[PDB]
Structure formats: C-alpha cells, structure tokens
Design an enzyme around this catalytic site. Sequence first.
Site, mmCIF file in Angstrom:
data_model
loop_
_atom_site.group_PDB
_atom_site.id
_atom_site.type_symbol
_atom_site.label_atom_id
_atom_site.label_comp_id
_atom_site.label_asym_id
_atom_site.label_seq_id
_atom_site.Cartn_x
_atom_site.Cartn_y
_atom_site.Cartn_z
ATOM 1 N N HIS A 1 -7.484 5.893 3.208
ATOM 2 C CA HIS A 1 -6.670 6.502 4.252
ATOM 3 C C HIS A 1 -5.648 7.493 3.719
ATOM 4 C CE1 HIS A 1 -8.072 3.190 6.922
ATOM 5 N NE2 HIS A 1 -7.937 2.451 5.836
ATOM 6 N N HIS B 1 -0.141 9.540 -4.697
ATOM 7 C CA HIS B 1 -0.767 9.552 -3.400
ATOM 8 C C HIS B 1 0.296 9.772 -2.378
ATOM 9 C CE1 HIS B 1 0.621 5.424 -4.048
ATOM 10 N NE2 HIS B 1 0.947 5.506 -2.773
ATOM 11 N N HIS C 1 2.009 9.868 1.773
ATOM 12 C CA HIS C 1 2.178 9.288 3.086
ATOM 13 C C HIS C 1 2.936 10.228 3.998
ATOM 14 C CE1 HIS C 1 0.906 5.154 1.886
ATOM 15 N NE2 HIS C 1 1.162 5.689 0.704
ATOM 16 N N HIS D 1 3.821 9.200 -3.691
ATOM 17 C CA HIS D 1 4.176 8.019 -4.467
ATOM 18 C C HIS D 1 3.687 8.074 -5.887
ATOM 19 C CE1 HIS D 1 4.497 5.747 -0.407
ATOM 20 N NE2 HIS D 1 5.471 6.616 -0.594
ATOM 21 N N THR E 1 2.924 -1.045 -0.377
ATOM 22 C CA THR E 1 3.055 -0.842 1.047
ATOM 23 C C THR E 1 1.741 -0.855 1.783
ATOM 24 O OG1 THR E 1 3.073 1.531 0.619
ATOM 25 C CG2 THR E 1 5.173 0.429 0.799
HETATM 26 C C1 LIG Z 1 -2.499 -0.632 -2.423
HETATM 27 N N1 LIG Z 1 -1.626 0.389 -2.914
HETATM 28 N N2 LIG Z 1 -0.401 0.630 -2.358
HETATM 29 C C2 LIG Z 1 0.376 1.629 -2.890
HETATM 30 S S1 LIG Z 1 1.981 2.147 -2.374
HETATM 31 N N3 LIG Z 1 1.875 2.878 -0.862
HETATM 32 O O1 LIG Z 1 2.882 0.966 -2.289
HETATM 33 O O2 LIG Z 1 2.546 3.144 -3.384
HETATM 34 S S2 LIG Z 1 -0.580 2.248 -4.163
HETATM 35 C C3 LIG Z 1 -1.951 1.180 -3.951
HETATM 36 N N4 LIG Z 1 -3.168 1.152 -4.724
HETATM 37 S S3 LIG Z 1 -3.306 2.085 -6.067
HETATM 38 O O3 LIG Z 1 -2.208 3.128 -6.075
HETATM 39 O O4 LIG Z 1 -4.644 2.764 -6.061
HETATM 40 C C4 LIG Z 1 -3.160 1.037 -7.565
HETATM 41 C C5 LIG Z 1 -3.153 1.637 -8.835
HETATM 42 C C6 LIG Z 1 -3.043 0.852 -9.982
HETATM 43 C C7 LIG Z 1 -2.938 -0.560 -9.868
HETATM 44 C C8 LIG Z 1 -2.815 -1.440 -11.147
HETATM 45 C C9 LIG Z 1 -3.570 -2.731 -10.933
HETATM 46 C C10 LIG Z 1 -1.327 -1.743 -11.419
HETATM 47 C C11 LIG Z 1 -3.420 -0.682 -12.371
HETATM 48 C C12 LIG Z 1 -2.945 -1.166 -8.593
HETATM 49 C C13 LIG Z 1 -3.055 -0.375 -7.444
HETATM 50 ZN ZN LIG Z 2 1.838 4.671 -0.665
#
Ligand SMILES: Cn1nc(S(N)(=O)=O)s/c1=N\S(=O)(=O)c1ccc(C(C)(C)C)cc1
Ligand SMILES: [Zn+2]
Lengths: 218, 226
Positions: free
Chosen positions: B64, B89, B91, B108, B170
């Site tokens: 998304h 990424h 938002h 982010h 988030t």
């Molecule tokens: C699920 N999620 N939420 C985010 S937010 N909106 O709080 O910045 S980023 C995300 N997934 S992600 O950025 O692809 C991610 C990247 C890398 C990891 C680790 C496991 C720490 C290497 C875990 C999740």
């Molecule tokens: Zn985010």
Amino acid sequence: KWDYKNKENGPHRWDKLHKDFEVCKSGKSQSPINIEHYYHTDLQFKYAASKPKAVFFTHHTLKASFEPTNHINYRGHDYVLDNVHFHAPMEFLINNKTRPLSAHFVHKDAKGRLLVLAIGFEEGKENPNLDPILEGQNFKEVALDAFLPKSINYYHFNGSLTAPPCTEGVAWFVIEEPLEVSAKQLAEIKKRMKNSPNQRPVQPDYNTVIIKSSAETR
Amino acid sequence: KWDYKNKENGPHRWDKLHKDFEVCKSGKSQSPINIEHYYHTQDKADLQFKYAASKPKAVFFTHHTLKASFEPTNHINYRGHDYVLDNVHFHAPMEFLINNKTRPLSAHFVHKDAKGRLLVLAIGFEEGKENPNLDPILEGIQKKQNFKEVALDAFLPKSINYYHFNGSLTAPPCTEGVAWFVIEEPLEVSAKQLAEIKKRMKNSPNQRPVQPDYNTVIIKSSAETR
Ligand SMILES: Cn1nc(S(N)(=O)=O)s/c1=N\S(=O)(=O)c1ccc(C(C)(C)C)cc1
Ligand SMILES: [Zn+2]
Ligand SMILES: Cn1nc(S(N)(=O)=O)s/c1=N\S(=O)(=O)c1ccc(C(C)(C)C)cc1
Ligand SMILES: [Zn+2]
C-alpha cells in the site's frame, strides 16, 4: 500458581504458566529495568488520612487496599488508589543504587490507564507510617498525606506490571529519595511475606524514554 | 489483504487478519498518536548522522506504499548503538500528528541495529514548492537497475527539532519497541509532486488511525543533520 522461586514457576518462566501472561516474555517495555541513562528535565495529589479497606499478604507479597477517595492527577485525569503494596527487595534499579524495600502506589484513571509510583527505603530510623499496615472493625487511618518526602526527585517512563500479567500501559514514577526505615521493621516485613523475596529480575530495556523532573508532594 | 477500507480488512480490525497482528489491538505502545503532551529538554549530543547521498539497490511499490531499499553503507550511530538505514517509504497524510497539526505527506527512514531494534525517522510535507529531493524520485518509478539518486543528505534539514518516544511500527504486524524520532519541520512538496505520488498510492490514504495513548513519555529536543 506463579511464584518468584528459582524453579519452574519463576519469573523467567512466567509466560508458559498461563496464556494471558505471555507478555512477561513477549513485551519490549517490561518492568522492572535498570535506570542509568535518562534525560533530565503535571502531577497532583489527593492523598489523606485513609483507613485501609483491607490489609494482607497476597499473591506472594503484602498489600494494603484503599477506599477510592484518595487520588493522583496526571494529564487532567484523576487516577484512583486501590492499593499500595511492597517489594523486598526493591524491584527497580536506580543508577545501580539498591534499596532493601520499595512500595507501589497503584492507581487507575477514568479511561483505564494505570499509574504506579515507586520509592525506595534505606535502613535507618523507625518509620511510623508503617505501623497501621503491620497492624492488620475499627480500622485505623493511614497518613497518605505524610508518607512521601515533601521534596521528591522522580523518574518517569512507560513500563509493565512487575508481577503477572505483566500488563503494559503503566505510567511509572520512581522516586530517587529513599524513605528511611529501622531494621526491626524491615526484618518484620520481610517475614510478613514469608521471608521470601518478591523482586522480579531486571527486564529487557529497549531504550525506555525516561524523564527526570521534580515535584513537591505537599 | 490488509487495507484501510473499513470492510473485513479495516485497521483496528488487523488483529483478526493474522494472529501475528494481535498486538495491533492488544498493544499498549501503539503508533500513531497525537503529539500534544511532551517534555522540553536538552541535547546530550546523543543522535548523530553520517548519512551520504547514495544510490538505491532497488525501488518498488509495496504493501500500500512506495518504498526504496538501500545498501548497508549508510548507518546511524546513537548512544553507542549503530543502526542501518534500510529503506524509505511514504505516507500521505502524515501519521504522527504534531500538536494536532496535519501534514499532507510523510516519509519514513527505517533503521536497524544488529539486533531487532528499530529506529524510524519521520518528517512532513506541505503543499507548495517543488521538492528537489523528490524530483529525482518520480523519475525513479520509470526505471529499474540504475535508479536515479536521492539527495538524501539534501533531503533532511541542516538543523533539526524532533519528538522522541518508544512506539510501534505503524503497519501490520504493528511491532512495538520502535524508537521514534518525529520531526516537526516539514519538507516542501509541489502540488504536482503531491498529486502524482497519491496515485502511485492510488489516491488512497494509507494512515493508520490514531491509537490509544498510555501516557506515552515524549521528549522534545533538537540536533544537526548537516
Ligand atoms: C510494517 N512496517 N511498518 C513501517 S512504519 N510505517 O512504522 O515505518 S515499515 C514496515 N515494514 S518494512 O519497512 O518493510 C521493514 C524493514 C525491515 C525490517 C527488519 C526486520 C528490522 C529488517 C522490518 C520491517
Ligand atoms: Zn510508514
Ligand atoms: C500484579 N500486580 N503488579 C503490580 S506492580 N508491582 O507493577 O505495581 S500491581 C498488581 N495487581 S493489583 O495492584 O492488585 C491491580 C491490578 C489491576 C487493577 C485494575 C484497576 C483492575 C486494572 C487494579 C489492581
Ligand atoms: Zn508492586
């Protein structure tokens, strides 16, 4: 029946005893922890002479309950004292400084959030605030209005219950000032908890944000 | 399957998508929230930046949102704890609310230490001027391999005020224990830049609704990025 003993029902094995209690293992903001790194930088009190509704050792520690008439205000919300209970040893570490006893003033607001208060005890003078708890139809009042130092350094952070279910969403205020206590009381209290130590080992801190501030209790 | 459309997949209703998402409702330190009560403090010179303008290993749209991945050549060192910028990424609108202030977009900066610990660095976007840091990106969706550069050291402000606390990711799995640095200062974004990314997210608002606060301790402080 969860316990603090070095065996299977011990603090390290609390999640695999009950299933509400996974948080003793799965949580990142678990209390207690060692407070050594923090940032230096709205609290109001409705504490008064109060008769404990009940006094007792329970769920492995001694505890005094209270009528919901005495309060603390934080962020414009009254939190209500249910009870105040004891831990021997002190569960929380203050800059690697240790005290032989602490006490938790447990509160709850209208929303539901818990707000607990921890303070240390150093061995010393005979502490007169303790007798009405040690004394437990005609219940004698307890001096909530005279318990804490008039001047207090506290530390504040987000943590957990330090005994199961290790519920999160608890506002911790821990006071740097110790309450002096004579050794005859300490020995007397450590045994009203069956001479069995009720302190949880330090939990993982993943950089808990702590503020140091100050206030006047009265 | 999890999306922001208030059907079977709605955001608080996340706990019922995987039971991996149970912390998204059962969690006590859940993000986002209204940054409205906080503590003014100093600078112990804690957070430091050795960022550089760097070429992305990959650019792709995912879950998304738009996202860019990065080599572990870029790090953040904080309190003796070094983190790696993993990705960036976006938002729109911004998820964290700054003194009840609404921004039309965020970005982010995801970081990771050798451990599981997370460090997100968030900053806002308002209607207006062309964002010269963004200009190299909307041309980045037309290409694989040699993706156009991000002036990332030219992305963030030279001098910075942030808000800091422990929160969660988030989005599902809504993992808690995430160190949030949320910046009040906005970067500017053209209405052309504003409109085109929203369609690369399908004009679909990807904000998790505001979570319950359990008296989250937030500090306000400042630093230098450049
Ligand atoms: C699920 N999620 N939420 C985010 S937010 N909106 O709080 O910045 S980023 C995300 N997934 S992600 O950025 O692809 C991610 C990247 C890398 C990891 C680790 C496991 C720490 C290497 C875990 C999740
Ligand atoms: Zn985010
Ligand atoms: C198990 N436990 N641990 C505590 S600590 N040491 O983190 O302050 S307090 C506690 N249980 S308790 O004080 O009896 C209590 C728990 C929960 C409530 C309500 C108000 C129902 C949330 C009221 C009282
Ligand atoms: Zn306690």
